[PDB]
Amino acid sequence: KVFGRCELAAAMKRHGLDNYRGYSLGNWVCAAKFESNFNTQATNRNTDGSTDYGILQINSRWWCNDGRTPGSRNLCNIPCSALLSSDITASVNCAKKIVSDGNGMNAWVAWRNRCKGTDVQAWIRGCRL
Ligand SMILES: [Cl-]
Ligand SMILES: [Cl-]
């Protein structure tokens, strides 16, 4: 599924991401825009052999099992395919674990390079929330 901006903001709010670990809703919407272009089915292979999955591009080396990443830890205890669903629940639940791991949202390269230190409130402007 490709989400609209406000539709995703509302879904993320319902799943408790607004101000989760101090990160306002706009941060999460901005990260999703630049990680996946709001597409739940996005996948990208990395040089180390791992793959990033879904709306928040969660990586198979640490967080989910895709059956082809040797030495993967599967910390979210889910198949990576579950992260591609139109229902973002699995992605949100896993993201909550990632953001709590010590480095906050810096775990998402696109967030660090394209969202951090910008007016992220713009990403939820105009939305009925
Ligand atoms: Cl915000
Ligand atoms: Cl933090």
Swiss-Prot record:
Reactions the enzyme catalyzes:
Hydrolysis of (1->4)-beta-linkages between N-acetylmuramic acid and N-acetyl-D-glucosamine residues in a peptidoglycan and between N-acetyl-D-glucosamine residues in chitodextrins
One GO CC term, this protein: cytoplasm
Q: Name residues in a coiled coil.
A: none
Compartments it resides in: Secreted
Function, as annotated, reads: Lysozymes have primarily a bacteriolytic function; those in tissues and body fluids are associated with the monocyte-macrophage system and enhance the activity of immunoagents. Has bacteriolytic activity against M.luteus.
* Additional record remark: Lysozyme C is capable of both hydrolysis and transglycosylation; it also shows a slight esterase activity. It acts rapidly on both peptide-substituted and unsubstituted peptidoglycan, and slowly on chitin oligosaccharides.
Concerning its family, UniProt says: Belongs to the glycosyl hydrolase 22 family.
State the protein's name. Lysozyme C
Provenance organism: Gallus gallus (Chicken)
Lineage, please? Answer: Eukaryota, Metazoa, Chordata, Craniata, Vertebrata
The gene from which this protein is expressed is: LYZ
